[PDB]
């Protein structure tokens, strides 16, 4: 079972339906509040672990009740917790405004995200290190480093966007593999080993050591595409060879996030969307 | 010492420091997040006692871990809770958006606020009645009954706009003081005895039986106005003559009223930022 070691952020999603945004001055009332668990480190997580690793999680809960329910949304989907910290103050929030017009506002602050201490022998015993960026780019980095050091497959996801161009260089020069939509690879300083970017309903490319290709997504109907980035990030890494590895390898496994992301597509909502891994089975076969 | 009745709700604050307000379909990165105790209800209680009235709060809390946190912010600044209730479920939260200009934007699902209803000894033994809409109309309506029943000063914050129509109408034609914003103002049903016009850092417009004029407010470089509000209502409650009174009475009102707001304006934060009495006295002396 291959094990994953996930270096990142959790928040706690809060959900209003609303007519319209509140102007200026102005106090609107929700129709609804939905509290869902989410963040791309608690996400990719999730997806990483229902697709068959070995999942550790290391990243900062607040001392609000939020973080009890990011805590028992991790250890129900078996993601394990030993290496996580507890901050004073509020988790990872994110505000998510939905309006009459179906158009989306997205409002997210770091929380305890922000205080979070890399632990190195953690990244021990792990075959891939899986990090991205809602946490600090220093901890991504130190992280980077110790799974360096343990032969530790180093992966990050170059997400949010709009990340300063040079706090990243160091990072840019340890990753083997980056994933990354075509908005946020333009601001990923220098190509990986292997660099993934994907592609929405088309599913992904590939781009480094192992040539350059296409990787197409299993055709299917959208209910929901929104979490469908982390579940590609965390079956990627459930499904990447530790070191060397090879080619055919490294394909298996971005066809299965492919399959995957694709999958995510189906259901509704962020946190909740990774499919198992037989469903990915399935969906492989199945074309 | 006047013992004022304020029958409304209170709500958990997230409260995120921008640069710019999000736009719909922004995706917006915050500068910080607080978590602090608040609601409209809760945040005129706590200015009305700092200001030196004898308070009581009357609102539903949720039978969550965050309802103590809340309970606990009244108790502190001398509010009293007899009348109060528990509504199963999550107690209010509320989105406070403050940007560089010190301008806000409030966004609230108010959970067990939208299920209070008429509590018997809400308004028991009081000179001023103040009310708010975030709860329902219905129940605000009741309350004003009651309170003129016993003479009490039905004032109303008519904030949020756009609420039940026929109830609005109904507490509109016995409502003696109505503290709105501009906007606000606007959708109101019909004029009260003293109708009371916010202009944010301007200070307030009064139209009504003692006629029609403006109150300035002293000038002050506005650190954030969130919650600014609220202290001008409950201060307003605080020094509102028994009815009848003579028209200097409410001008001193107005006055100490305007004062407040506009200290509260100088400090970070929502639902702590009402100033002591003698700090309105202070800024008064000042000019
Ligand atoms: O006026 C600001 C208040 O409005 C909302 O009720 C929030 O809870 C906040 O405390
Ligand atoms: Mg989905
Ligand atoms: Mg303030």
């Not at 291959?2 to 706690?12: A, D, K, L």
């Not at 939905?98 to 979070?116: Q, R």
């Not at 694709?262 to 074309?287: E, F, H, K, Q, Y």
Request: hydrophobic share 50%.
């Amino acid at each position: 079972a291959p094990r994953v070691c996930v270096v990142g952020s959790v928040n706690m999603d809060l959900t209003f339906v609303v007519d319209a945004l509140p102007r200026p001055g102005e106090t609107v009332l929700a129709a609804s509040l939905t509290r869902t668990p989410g963040g791309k480190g608690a996400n990719q997580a999730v997806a990483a672990a229902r697709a068959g690793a070995q999942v550790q999680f290391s990243g900062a809960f607040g001392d609000d009740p939020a973080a009890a329910q990011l805590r028992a949304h991790l250890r129900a989907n078996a993601v394990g917790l030993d290496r996580t910290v507890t901050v004073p103050g509020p988790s990872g929030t994110a505000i998510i405004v939905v309006d009459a017009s179906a158009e989306n506002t997205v409002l997210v602050a770091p929380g305890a995200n922000a205080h979070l201490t890399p632990v190195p022998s953690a990244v021990a015993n792990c075959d891939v290190l899986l990090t991205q960026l809602e946490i600090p780019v220093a901890t991504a980095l130190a992280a980077a480093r110790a799974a360096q050091s343990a032969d530790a497959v180093v992966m990050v996801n170059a997400s949010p966007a709009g990340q300063d161009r040079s706090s990243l260089q160091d990072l840019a020069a340890i990753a083997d593999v980056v994933i990354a939509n075509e908005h946020e690879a333009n601001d990923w300083p220098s190509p990986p080993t292997h660099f993934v970017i994907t592609l929405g309903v088309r599913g992904a490319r590939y781009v480094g050591a192992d040539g350059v290709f296409e990787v197409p997504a299993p055709t299917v109907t959208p209910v929901d595409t929104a979490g469908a980035g982390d579940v590609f990030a965390g079956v990627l890494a459930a499904n990447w060879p530790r070191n060397p590895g090879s080619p055919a390898e490294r394909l298996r496994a971005l066809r299965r996030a492919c399959a995957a992301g694709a999958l995510a597509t189906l259901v509704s909502g962020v946190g909740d969307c990774a499919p198992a891994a037989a469903a990915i089975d399935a969906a492989l076969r199945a074309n």
